[PDB]
Amino acid sequence: AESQLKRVIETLRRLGIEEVLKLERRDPQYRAVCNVVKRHGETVGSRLAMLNALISYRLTGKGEEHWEYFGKYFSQLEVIDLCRDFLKYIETSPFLKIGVEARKKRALKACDYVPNLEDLGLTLRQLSHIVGARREQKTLVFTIKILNYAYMCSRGVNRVLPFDIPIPVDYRVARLTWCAGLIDFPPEEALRRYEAVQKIWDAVARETGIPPLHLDTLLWLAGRAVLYGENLHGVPKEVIALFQWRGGCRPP
Numbered sequence: 625a626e627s628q629l630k631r632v633i634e635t636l637r638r639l640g641i642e643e644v645l646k647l648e649r650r651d652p653q654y655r656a657v658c659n660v661v662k663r664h665g666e667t668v669g670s671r672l673a674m675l676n677a678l679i680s681y682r683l684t685g686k687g688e689e690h691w692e693y694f695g696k697y698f699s700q701l702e703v704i705d706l707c708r709d710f711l712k713y714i715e716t717s718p719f720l721k722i723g724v725e726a727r728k729k730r731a732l733k734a735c736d737y738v739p740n741l742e743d744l745g746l747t748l749r750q751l752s753h754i755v756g757a758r759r760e761q762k763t764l765v766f767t768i769k770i771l772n773y774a775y776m777c778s779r780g781v782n783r784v785l786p787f788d789i790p791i792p793v794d795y796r797v798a799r800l801t802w803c804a805g806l807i808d809f810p811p812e813e814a815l816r817r818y819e820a821v822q823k824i825w826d827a828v829a830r831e832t833g834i835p836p837l838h839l840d841t842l843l844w845l846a847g848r849a850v851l852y853g854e855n856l857h858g859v860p861k862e863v864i865a866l867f868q869w870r871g872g873c874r875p876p
């Protein structure tokens with residue numbers, strides 16, 4: 625795990641933060657969010673993207689497919705009242721059919737909230753209170769990453785996220801951490817012990833110069849290839865190889 629930790633650091637050190645930012649523009653999720661922002665403008669588009677991130681849990685299929693549906697839905701539809709229209713979308717989407725009333729309830733709490741795209745740290749604190757969760761919880765930090773996508777699209781700029789916002793420990797991140805040999809307890813346990821997993825990726829961030837929410841992009845892109853055998857050039861070959869250390873960590 626210490627030896628694996630060193631291998632991971634010295635491999636990702638090969639990629640600058642500049643290369644990571646470039647790689648990140650090819651995330652299918654970035655394209656969906658950017659299509660919605662181009663259609664609706666910065667304020668409305670960023671609100672829609674925010675709401676989508678806040679309910680991106682217990683999906684039927686892949687994260688990426690859910691985001692593609694979101695992009696197509698809002699890119700070709702006029703939006704008048706944001707709460708109403710978003711709740712209607714929740715009732716329609718095949719990715720969101722599980723626990724729809726609890727989803728609507730969460731969306732209703734954050735409905736009227738306008739995020740501050742220039743101070744994402746302030747926004748994370750505000751979201752923690754509105755939604756009612758610890759700031760390190762996976763859906764909160766993932767929402768910050770989505771907000772960065774919306775800002776970068778809107779303004780046509782790069783922006784490197786802070787080191788002090790940790791990685792979102794979903795089931796994909798937990799499995800990949802296990803697959804790279806960085807943890808000895810199972811991925812299902814890692815979801816509960818998310819702070820311990822966050823501590824590992826913080827170490828990696830400090831030593832590589834790649835902040836945790838940008839590391840998240842590398843794991844998600846790599847996961848597409850290791851778990852499903854798809855988008856095989858999403859990251860360099862040597863990055864993929866890091867997450868194939870344990871037996872089972874290959875496509876069927």
Ligand SMILES: Nc1nc2c([nH]c(=O)n2[C@H]2C[C@H](O)[C@@H](CO)O2)c(=O)[nH]1
Nearest residue numbers: 680681682687762763766792794844
């Ligand atoms: N870590 C992470 N999670 C994602 C991504 N896309 C997506 O839909 N998710 C989901 C998984 C989980 O339910 C929530 C927080 O991680 O967001 C994504 O790119 N990264």
Ligand SMILES: Nc1nc2c([nH]c(=O)n2[C@H]2C[C@H](O)[C@@H](CO)O2)c(=O)[nH]1
Nearest residue numbers: 705706707708709711712728732735
């Ligand atoms: N479409 C919809 N809107 C709802 C529900 N519950 C609720 O409080 N609303 C809110 C959204 C918005 O702020 C207002 C309609 O304009 O009513 C609900 O169940 N559906």
